[PDB]
Amino acid sequence: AMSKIICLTAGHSNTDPGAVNGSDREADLAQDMRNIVASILRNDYGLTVKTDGTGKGNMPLRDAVKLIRGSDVAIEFHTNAAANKTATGIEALSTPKNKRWCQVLGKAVAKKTGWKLRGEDGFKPDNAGQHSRLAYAQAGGIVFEPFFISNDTDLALFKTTKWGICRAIADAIAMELGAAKV
Amino acid sequence: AMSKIICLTAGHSNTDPGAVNGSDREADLAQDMRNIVASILRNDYGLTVKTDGTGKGNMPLRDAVKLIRGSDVAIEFHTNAAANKTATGIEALSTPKNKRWCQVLGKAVAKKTGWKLRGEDGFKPDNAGQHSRLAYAQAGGIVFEPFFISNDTDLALFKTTKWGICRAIADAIAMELGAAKV
């Protein structure tokens, strides 16, 4: 696990913040997910994590893809959104190579939240995907959408259990890599 | 600053979360402040920080005061609240003896955000106080309330710039303790 490289990035930016629900912005939620998961992987496990920093995300695709290629797992955090404010659940978009990783991530979040796993236990393939960062998924990264920002109830749960959810994600990544806590 | 000790805690708990504004809760914002500032002081400045953990707060007073007494500076993060939803500004409650630290913190946040300083450049004394954790300030800790959760505009600013606000706080603490800015 100490030879492994985990890439974590955040979708969207301060100027183009993705989906919004009130004063909650996708860009901000994605920044929190990337930062918290990164910090736990580094602190609790001493693992190598490469990121697009601690600020907002939306690293240029060219640069992102270079990071994807240099890593063992690469995850960009996003929130889902629908006009239907009852739409709910967890999904991760990637190539079939990454199905197991998508399922590990999705299950980690489902256990903590009771949210529904969409797709195949949280996996949706790139060949059928529609996304602003579909190119990231096509390149072998994972576009992870743990919840719909448009779902007020799920968003409230996320906001009240953010650190616990992100710890579940970090712990699941470490477990899959066989990394013990340090 | 390498031999100094900082204490950081958070107000309120998961099931008694303090003031709320929609699905934003004081306990959760306080947890973010405490965790982000602590992580910057530890990871960027290499300083020694004592905390009530990475979860929710409301460490018992007997325990909290042990940390206050064993630190060079001790801050519990809270949010202010009012019936008047346009009430605004920064305050830090502590003993008179501890005025300078309160003003350092408040002015740092004012510079970053443009928020108004309440009291004397952010300081308010423990001897005229009304607060659930007044006893934390009475012991010479600092009950820090950088903004009113009840103010939609200021809460939104916190939400969109929190990592910068928390870095401004961490920088102010480090520099006052003798460390070079990072």
Ligand SMILES: [Zn+2]
């Ligand atoms: Zn997105």
Ligand SMILES: [Zn+2]
């Ligand atoms: Zn409070």
